[PDB]
Design a protein around this ligand. Structure first.
Ligand code: VO4
Length: 282
């Protein structure tokens, strides 16, 4: 009964109500509004909760699901790249997971700069990209890894591991098995990098706002939310956190679209069922 169609319908009903409540009004005080005239939101209807915003000129949010702390963002606009790199560096980012595919990035109508597979200079910031590993995730899905070295006068140089799911499908959801493999790779990559900072005595270890995995697809609400949900289920600290809790938390902390598609929620439900984790709050 806990995972039956009735429970699933009730979960969707609660989440739909929340999405509606969280829909943005004009100049909504809950959502970040552009300063200085630059385009902020890649998608007009996909907004950035103001109180959890990372930077005033990015569509990007701090998210905590149970105990699990991440940043979810949109794919940065070309005009946002310097600020996006500064976000990555200041966060001492232990992994950047990019879930927009190579095909999507290559479609220049989408305006998604190839910012992590090429080197370049963006205002005051110089970035070098290097190819590292490739890890299969199942079903032919491949994670291509990179390291980004981010340099800027007056700033410590930061290297960021990148996990790019270069052949993430855009028309269909990846399975729970692929999602689990992806979450494990992203978590493991982050743990290795965080450990390096710990070993060096970085002050970022004590700061709630830093050392967060950064995750985006195109909008940062669909594939991104599926992955964040899977990651929180991997976290030993999150016993009894329900699917209702996780999705409600993502929605209140970013926007009401988090977990955009029913197919994505289906994966989270299946992962939860595998753990005996509740769907609903009693
Ligand atoms: O500026 V640190 O996060 O390497 O202490």
């Amino acid at each position: 009964s806990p995972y039956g169609p009735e429970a699933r319908a009730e979960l969707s009903s609660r989440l739909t109500t929340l999405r509606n409540t969280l829909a943005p009004a004009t100049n909504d005080p809950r959502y970040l509004q552009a300063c200085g005239g630059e385009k902020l939101n890649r998608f007009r209807d996909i907004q950035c909760r103001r109180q959890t915003a990372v930077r005033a000129d990015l569509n990007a949010n701090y998210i905590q699901v149970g105990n699990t702390r991440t940043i979810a963002c949109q794919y940065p606009l070309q005009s946002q790249l310097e600020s996006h790199f500064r976000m990555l560096a200041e966060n001492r980012t232990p992994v950047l997971a990019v879930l927009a595919s190579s095909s999507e990035i290559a479609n220049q109508r989408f305006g998604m700069p190839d910012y992590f597979r090429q080197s370049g200079t963006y205002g005051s910031i110089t970035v070098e990209s290097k190819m590292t590993q490739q890890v299969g995730l199942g079903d032919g899905i491949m994670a291509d890894m990179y390291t980004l070295t981010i340099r800027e006068a007056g700033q410590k140089t930061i290297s960021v591991p990148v996990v790019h799911v270069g052949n993430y499908p855009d028309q269909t959801a990846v399975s729970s098995e692929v999602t689990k493999a992806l979450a494990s790779l992203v978590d493991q990559t982050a743990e290795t990098k965080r450990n390096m900072y710990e070993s060096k005595g970085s002050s970022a270890v004590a700061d709630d706002s830093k050392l967060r995995p950064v995750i985006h697809c195109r909008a940062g609400v669909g594939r991104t939310a599926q992955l964040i949900g899977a990651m929180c289920m991997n976290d030993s600290r999150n016993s009894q956190l329900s699917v209702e809790d996780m999705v409600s938390q993502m929605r209140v902390q970013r926007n009401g679209i988090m977990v955009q598609k029913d197919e994505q929620l289906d994966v989270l439900i299946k992962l939860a069922e595998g753990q005996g984790r509740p769907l609903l709050n009693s």
